[model samples]
Target: GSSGSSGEKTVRVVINFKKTQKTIVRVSPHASLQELAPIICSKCEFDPLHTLLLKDYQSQEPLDLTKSLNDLGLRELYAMDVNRESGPSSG
Candidate 1:
């Protein structure tokens, strides 16, 4: 296996941490949300804030966040962060 590719994997909070915000972060395609949730939770810094939970905000429904981003077909590109898309499969 060549280490040339994918030498970089995770460990960064690409999002600008703010108050009262809940958004799935861009950890990695293989990064599991359940594993990622806590890392991102305290990566930058932790302040006694609301309990962080993994929930992919969808229109009129909630999706599993425990799965990897690849499983969710989510790119490093956001699924329109904060805006619950009602897009029909987006096909």
Candidate 2:
């Protein structure tokens, strides 16, 4: 997959997931969430935009996803908070 926006830190991956399980199964930390997005969308068949590339996207400090695990900051991809009740962002 190509980078959607400029300055977007990206990586490539081949992820394997199960429908019933919550686990990501086999996630290569070497890979970037940008790379994982498509596969995740495919596996769950969810919209890529609606699909979350989570983590501390809520935080003021943004981390680079392209960096190695040790090099990257606190950008841990968890789940997307879609409620948007508070407005601009969801933690």
Candidate 3:
């Protein structure tokens, strides 16, 4: 497959990470970390924070997960120093 330039794909964070006290949760690859805030808040019955996000390592900007896997180029784009601070693990 030929590579096409996708420029910058943006992910909107729908939820804040600091609003909940729960230590565990389930998530989907296609859903942004922001979107998961409410669910976490719901189960914990706590109001989540309003400014948490998972961003890129270089620019440190929130990323959207609705794009192609190759776009992230997991092994190269962020291979040397990938940041995993902003995301949640799936169940």
Candidate 4:
């Protein structure tokens, strides 16, 4: 198998929330939303599960937690919105 520059490829994306705050993060294209949600929650100081709505603000397309960015057809410069429907879910 040939190893290309993709060995170190990273997806850089922007997350917009809190009215006017935007956060830029770099992640692997194969990363799942479950893995990503925590990092975003940590940076925004919000409860992870509380973020129930994750979508592309421009396209209004929803992102799946179980799927990777590559599987979702997202590019490296994609953008996302995090909306809280309620408090964190109860276990």
User: What digit string (tens of lDDT, one per residue) describes model 2 on residues 15-74?
Assistant: 222322333333445555566555555555655565444443343333354653335543
Model 2 scores a TM of 0.38
Sort the candidates on TM-score, descending order. 4, 1, 2, 3
Q: Which is the better candidate, 1 or 3, if ranked by TM-score?
A: 1
Q: For every model shown, what is its TM-score relative to the native structure?
A: 0.39, 0.38, 0.29, 0.60
Q: What digit string (tens of lDDT, one per residue) describes model 1 on residues 1-91?
A: 2223553574333433443344444456576655554555555443313333323333323335556656766442212224233446553
* Candidate 4 weakest lDDT stretch, 10 residues: 75-84
Please give the lDDT score for candidate 3: 0.36
Candidate 2 segments exceeding 4 Å error: 1-21, 56-64, 67-76, 81-91
Candidate whose lDDT is highest: 4
The true-versus-predicted C-alpha distance at residue 32 of model 3, in Å, is 0.4
Error of 3 at 80 (Å): 29
Q: What is the C-alpha lDDT of each candidate?
A: 0.43, 0.43, 0.36, 0.59
Best by TM-score: 4
Task: Candidate 2: give the clashing pairs.
Answer: none
- Summarize candidate 4's per-residue lDDT along 1-91 as a digit string, tens digits: 2233443566676666654576777767676767767655666665775564356545555667778777777642223435556457776
Please list the Cα RMSD from the true structure of every candidate, rounded to 1 decimal place: 10.9, 8.8, 15.0, 7.2
Measured with C-alpha atoms, the lDDT of residue 3 in candidate 3 is 43
In model 1, the Cα lDDT at residue 53 comes to 30
